[PDB]
Design a protein around this nucleic acid. Structure first.
Lengths: 215, 226
RNA sequence: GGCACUAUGGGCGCAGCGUCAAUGACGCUGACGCUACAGGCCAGACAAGAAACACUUGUCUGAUAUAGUGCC
């Protein structure tokens, strides 16, 4: 019967000067034993709010915590560029202590189409007997973008993995990379490799591609 | 900010193995405070593990680690310990020690946090990364810029450092998160964009540094043509 | 289990003994007396002690807490 601490929204896109609230809800009473933490990627959590409503030190006046019954809320009164991080609620009313699962607070940007780049395997890597095709979506917004792998105009599935960056510091864009992995047997067994990118900033899906060696 | 917690003792372990983290207090005496361990699985949120309270030495544990882990403090060495026994894979996380602040200044807030040590629980084995170039293309370059990159593949465990041309060229670069792949080996690629005018005028070399296997690899990236 | 009865705090004497030295101290033991002051004993709440539990201390609320001797 641990106390659960259900936090929402899990993600949040705002621009600067926006009011932002991050609610959290205790499944039991936790009195005011509720803290708020900030975390930025690869760093430790910062204490922000203790005892449900009191600022820890070096927290500036735009932060604020409040309680109603079991409903606790962090509130940024007017969001500042420093303030785009993850936020966790924690209850310390009984053991075991539990955290909220987090709220990710992202910057709102103008829409930007990606610039697509496609990379064949290397000569080194095919001497290794396995082939990897890599496609590069670069500096787009928002995050949403579908990459489709067609081989000789045949859609692939299961044989690709993707990964995205965090919002850039300079221009708040993203980047995604997709990797199709094949047998060296299967890489040579086909002639056309295509990378299909559908995205909001594209009026029509940009698709880049290569054939064999095409030196 | 003379108050500081310094962690150590993590690393890579077979499942069922053991590992002993230690948190080194300086700036305060540990015996006057509750000490907490909070782990963070890669890609996930904060999970509370254990604590020990002052004056009583009472210890508390998450259900998930209850009986395998054992928290303690050596008050003469002013440090806290976490004895992890019979590790399971999902014990993999960055582990943090946190100081619980004073009842009448910060409630039960954790006001000073460790730094994290990474603990991995794997029956996999160390493997340096194979580095392959992502060769810039035919450089048709309607926008006057091309992308070149390094695929860093089949490596274990994390992390990997990637720098381009030994610290220079920090601009345009994007190193991506690694992905766990079917083999159980991680792979990531790092990419930089650059004006395609200096394509050939300047040559580009990523510096892949994988300390867990002691591989320090450099690869030149350029096209091949006819 | 119920019901009564008594006893329970500090001091202060009184004896008796121990306990260490070996000569003095020092203890307990006494429903063993002495006194006016009171407090002990138990449970809960709250506050502070570097204090979530435990520990210590204080305040507040309830009376409780022990025994012994009878009776049911």
């Amino acid at each position: 019967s641990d106390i659960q601490m259900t936090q929402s929204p899990s993600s949040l896109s705002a621009s600067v000067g926006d009011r932002v609230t991050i609610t959290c809800r205790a499944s039991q009473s936790v009195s005011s034993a509720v803290a708020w933490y900030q975390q930025k990627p690869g760093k430790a959590p910062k204490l922000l709010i203790y005892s449900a409503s009191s600022l820890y030190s070096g927290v500036p006046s735009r932060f604020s915590g409040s309680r109603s019954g079991t409903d606790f809320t962090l509130t940024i009164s007017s969001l500042q560029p420093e303030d785009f991080a993850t936020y966790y609620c924690q209850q310390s009313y009984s053991f075991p202590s539990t955290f909220g699962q987090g709220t990710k607070v992202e910057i709102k940007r103008t829409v930007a189409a990606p610039s697509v780049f496609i990379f064949p395997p290397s000569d080194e890597q095919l001497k290794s007997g396995t082939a990897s095709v890599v496609c590069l979506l670069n500096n787009f917004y928002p995050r949403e973008a579908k990459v489709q792998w067609k081989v000789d105009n045949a859609l692939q599935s299961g044989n690709s993995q993707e990964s995205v960056t965090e919002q850039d510091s300079k221009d708040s864009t993203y980047s995604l990379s997709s990797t199709l992995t094949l047998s060296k047997a299967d890489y040579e067994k086909h002639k056309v490799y295509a990378c299909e990118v559908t995205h909001q900033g594209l009026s029509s899906p940009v698709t880049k591609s290569f054939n064999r060696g095409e030196c | 900010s003379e108050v500081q917690l310094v962690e150590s003792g993590g690393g890579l372990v077979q499942p069922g193995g053991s590992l002993r983290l230690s948190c080194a207090a300086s700036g305060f005496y540990i015996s006057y405070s509750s000490i907490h361990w909070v782990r963070q699985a890669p890609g996930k949120g904060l999970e509370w593990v254990a604590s020990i309270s002052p004056y009583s030495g009472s210890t508390y544990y998450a259900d998930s680690v209850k009986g395998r882990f054992t928290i303690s403090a050596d008050t003469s060495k002013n440090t806290a310990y976490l004895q992890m026994n019979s590790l399971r894979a999902e014990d993999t996380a960055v582990y943090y020690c946190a100081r619980q602040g004073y009842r009448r200044r910060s409630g039960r807030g954790f006001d000073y946090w460790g730094q994290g040590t990474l603990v991995t629980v794997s029956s996999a084995s160390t493997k340096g990364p194979s580095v392959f170039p992502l060769a810039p293309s035919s450089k048709s370059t309607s926008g006057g810029t091309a992308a070149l990159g390094c695929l860093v593949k089949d490596y274990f465990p994390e992390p990997v450092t990637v720098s381009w041309n030994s610290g220079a060229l920090t601009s345009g670069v994007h190193t991506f998160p690694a992905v766990l792949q079917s083999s159980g080996l991680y792979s990531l690629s790092s990419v930089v964009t650059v004006p395609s005018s200096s394509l050939g005028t300047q040559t580009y070399i990523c510096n892949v540094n994988h300390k867990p296997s002691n591989t320090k690899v450099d690869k030149k990236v350029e096209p091949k043509s006819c």
